[PDB]
Amino acid sequence: CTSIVAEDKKGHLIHGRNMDFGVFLGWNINNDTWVITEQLKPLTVNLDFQRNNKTVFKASSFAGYVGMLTGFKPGLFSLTLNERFSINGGYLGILEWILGKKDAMWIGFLTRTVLENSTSYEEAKNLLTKTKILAPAYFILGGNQSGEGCVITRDRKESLDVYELDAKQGRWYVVQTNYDRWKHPFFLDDRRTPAKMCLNRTSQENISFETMYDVLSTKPVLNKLTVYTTLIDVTKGQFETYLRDCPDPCIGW
């Protein structure tokens, strides 16, 4: 996955993400695709969650999966989740849950609770920062005012770091793939550096839905695992997601 929260010259927030998933079922040697990735594209749906014929939050999810991986509350905040890798991952977290310690929330469910029930960017931020979880994760969260955008690197029981926007110091975007910002990306899978060069070439002035979709279409930020691309605009209420393909030639991950 790749999640970006950018801020144009006039303080407008654009939140874009790519959803990479599907290495686990293997490879389709006949047309050069991942088995799950191709099977998730016809399952991808957009969801207008309503209460009293009024939109609570919108989302992009896979049909039959009740948690939320991409979504926003119109005019409030936007939230995408990126997978984080760890030593044992969810497995301790799952073990503790079976043996009886249920004081922690499942990863898809918490972002589902935050999108459905949180009221502000600060409320969402506080809950994603300090809620116990069963597995590590990246929470990429943008707000409705200027400077309200951050990546929350999460351990199971602790917030390792929160990387926020600072336009005054020249930081107008936050990128996050699947590796800790202070650490280095795995040699064979660096999508964070091309994402930045494309954002840097685009310039803060020109960042928009069109240029944000541009960077998420550049290989390897676009790759065989990319199921969909979502561009969010919390203030304008716009929420578009598009199924993707990466025709040969294209990197696999």
Binding site: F49, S60, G89, W106, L134, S217, T241
Partner: protein, 114 residues
């Protein structure tokens, strides 16, 4: 290796863009058991394809049937009841798609399972 940053790719067109994705409206005023009924009636065949393709990868290590008996018969009680809307939301999805509850749960906790 990286590629030259792409230009003029929006609105989406070309071999980069499989197609738009449809909107469904989920009414939270309905009880959780009935929230996904409309969506799952239209999407049940596609999710059944995944569970098939999930069985084939499992089969290459240990036989799948014996694996899936345990997931369906013993996992839902192993994990207990999930909080809030989710136990009912997943129970609804399991009934409308004719897919066992353990597999609907396995789908929904796939992140923790990696």
């Amino acid at each position: 290796w990286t590629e030259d940053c792409r230009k003029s790719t929006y609105p989406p067109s070309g071999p980069t863009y499989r197609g738009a994705v449809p909107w469904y409206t989920i009414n939270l005023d309905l009880p959780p058991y009935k929230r996904w009924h409309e969506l799952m009636l239209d999407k049940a065949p596609m999710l059944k394809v995944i569970v098939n393709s999930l069985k084939n990868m499992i089969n290459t290590f240990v036989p799948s049937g014996k694996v899936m008996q345990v997931v369906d018969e013993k996992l839902p009680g192993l994990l207990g009841n999930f909080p809030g809307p989710f136990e009912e939301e997943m129970k609804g999805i399991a009934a409308v798609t004719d897919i066992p509850l353990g597999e609907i749960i396995s789908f929904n906790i796939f992140y923790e399972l990696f």
